[PDB]
Design a protein around this ligand. Sequence first.
Ligand SMILES: [Zn+2]
Ligand SMILES: [Zn+2]
Ligand SMILES: [Zn+2]
Ligand SMILES: [Zn+2]
Lengths: 199, 202, 201, 201
Amino acid sequence: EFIPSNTDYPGPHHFEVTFQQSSTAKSATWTYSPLLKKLYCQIAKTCPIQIKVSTPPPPGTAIRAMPVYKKAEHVTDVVKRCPNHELGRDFNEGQSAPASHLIRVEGNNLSQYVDDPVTGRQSVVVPYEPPQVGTEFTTILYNFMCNSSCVGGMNRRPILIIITLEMRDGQVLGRRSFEGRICACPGRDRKADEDHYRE
Amino acid sequence: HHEFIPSNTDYPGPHHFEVTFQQSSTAKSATWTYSPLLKKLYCQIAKTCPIQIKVSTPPPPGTAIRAMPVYKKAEHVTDVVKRCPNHELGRDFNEGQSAPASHLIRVEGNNLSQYVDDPVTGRQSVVVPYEPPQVGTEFTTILYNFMCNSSCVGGMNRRPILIIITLEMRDGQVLGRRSFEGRICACPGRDRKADEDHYREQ
Amino acid sequence: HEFIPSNTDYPGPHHFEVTFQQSSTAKSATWTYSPLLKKLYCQIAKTCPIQIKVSTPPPPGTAIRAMPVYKKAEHVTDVVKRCPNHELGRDFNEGQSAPASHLIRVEGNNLSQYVDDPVTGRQSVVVPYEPPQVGTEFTTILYNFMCNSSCVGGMNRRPILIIITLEMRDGQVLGRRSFEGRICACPGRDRKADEDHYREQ
Amino acid sequence: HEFIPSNTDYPGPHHFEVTFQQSSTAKSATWTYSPLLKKLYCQIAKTCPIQIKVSTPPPPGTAIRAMPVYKKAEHVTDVVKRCPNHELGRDFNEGQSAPASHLIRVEGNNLSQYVDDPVTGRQSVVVPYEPPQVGTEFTTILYNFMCNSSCVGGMNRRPILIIITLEMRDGQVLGRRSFEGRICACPGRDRKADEDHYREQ
DNA sequence: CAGGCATGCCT
DNA sequence: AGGCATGCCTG
DNA sequence: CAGGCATGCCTG
DNA sequence: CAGGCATGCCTG
Ligand SMILES: [Zn+2]
Ligand SMILES: [Zn+2]
Ligand SMILES: [Zn+2]
Ligand SMILES: [Zn+2]
């Protein structure tokens, strides 16, 4: 799949991706704009994402996160960290994650980082865990290692984050995508975006 | 089983598990005060903090109650809550203590209190078996001590924490869970007054 | 050798002098110099001409060394090098005799030697001293700077000084002049802005 | 066991001077020096440049030892160490050469020798003496101070003096200088507050 | 036991 | 830079 | 933390 | 080529 699909597909387990209530602070670690279906967050901060499933998926089921560029002109490029953050010492000493992936998982020994031999795509996968008793959602901790504005990397090009519920073989059970923007001042760039969504 | 992100989502369960606090002194530098307006416990380091356990139905045998701290804010949720290096290797409240110096929470006056060190999650918790309420008391009282201030550099470093109390069986299946914010400070009455006034301006 | 390179001016026996010709006043001029702030403004990879003058010819085997170093003491111990992005880029790198990490290049002189000091790690570029052409007043050296002063992963908005050292075959210092360096995209803009803030309160 | 090293100001033969350069007036500047109080204000683990001037070049093997001691008499018997928090902590302790437990470290010099005096228990960091470079006035040494002055478990608000000693390879003292040290979060505020009060009294 | 300070850290 | 947070002293 | 400056790059 | 912007990062 040179161009992975971003179509919403709830599927047999009704896969839903939601965000908790976040800070309205100008430079909060992360905020979500329901209006824009757009995640804002800062580089290397913990982003908690919320999944929901109606009926649990099969043993060996898992969650996949792949970034993809928004604009049709740039969809064919694999999304990676820019050279500066990849080679730089920040967040790279003693890390299992390959220094090249844009998306990391936090707080999970069982995270596996996939480098597709055919497509070249990079993505991070964790085995599905059912919510703990009393809890409604399962929470995956995501980190994004580059700014959307990084030159040599994303280079101010918006991306979309594809979360995919898969079967151990690879069979997609559900799919959700949202816009992702890594920036320094999320509260600011959200308010600017919405004020200009008046049109 | 092992969980890396302990959920603090309140869950009463089949036994209607409830965690409440008795009346507390409003004195500035009192040993502990509780703000139900904020579900926030203010207590001093290494002082006796009674907790109230209540259930509508007696729980099964081998049931216990576990007490583990977690950082409130997700940015730090992954960090295991422990003591600061100063107090861990200090000379205070560590001489001859059946408790590991590294644990933040301890139990007072219960020789059945064991301290776990989950080697998979590295998390530290304290487990005591479920004793009923004393005849004529309507609730089970559990004495907790917290051996490191919220502000201690090298450990919590001014990071809020939550205290998760969990009602579980001998194997670890959770039956019920209540959480509340914990602040280990020096002038609990002042800092409860400050917080409560702030929430009241909006 | 010396892990913290000196930047103090030293004319020495030959009155080593370092000057800049007249520069354009354009916002996006390739380079401009501010004698008020002793700062140079230049563009990435653009020819920047520096002018060298001495009163009396130095001995044979004399050289000119150009070395950058951070201005603030909290950063001086770090070596000034290209950012990863420019270093690994195809631009100005394949088909070039300069190491892709050196910040300062010499334009138009194949006798220039790029030095990586094995003990101190400092990077520099050295050219043999040449007397001004006949009837000319100064020896001009064409320098190139390969990172913007703000490049993340390299200079990272940290101010540098460029140190021009007159030295002999062995390396003894015959003279030294220095001046603050700033690589950017609009040198006229940033110069007018710093000269305006020089007259503050 | 007991040492109580001298802090008596003693220039000796080579005219040993220890001075400071122009520092910032900002509240949270990294470091600042009030000649009025002979007192150095600085932030924790930040680069503090020390200027050392002499007259005659000392013998070979002559080195420079920075040792901290407490000011008030009731404390001078106590050894100035790092608090257990910063010593056992990870901050500024990963991948370095200095013992986690020292207060004073030298930044940017691999010849520095951290000394654990087996008799006196005193901790000090010794660097060899290198002369100024061609054209410069002083030898600049770069010092880091690992704890705040207010660290409980360590200094604990007690003021300290830092003893800069020029000394021979045998240990013979060729000159000594001293000044108060304060490691705080806002050196400008506290220096401004310190000078103001003294002037008013 | 509350008033209030010095000083780190947030605003 | 201004001011608040917060351990700890003091009376 | 919110305000506004610092800068590379667009735009016409 | 000058005006203006987008966005990382200080400033008070
Ligand atoms: Zn990047
Ligand atoms: Zn502690
Ligand atoms: Zn660069
Ligand atoms: Zn300390």
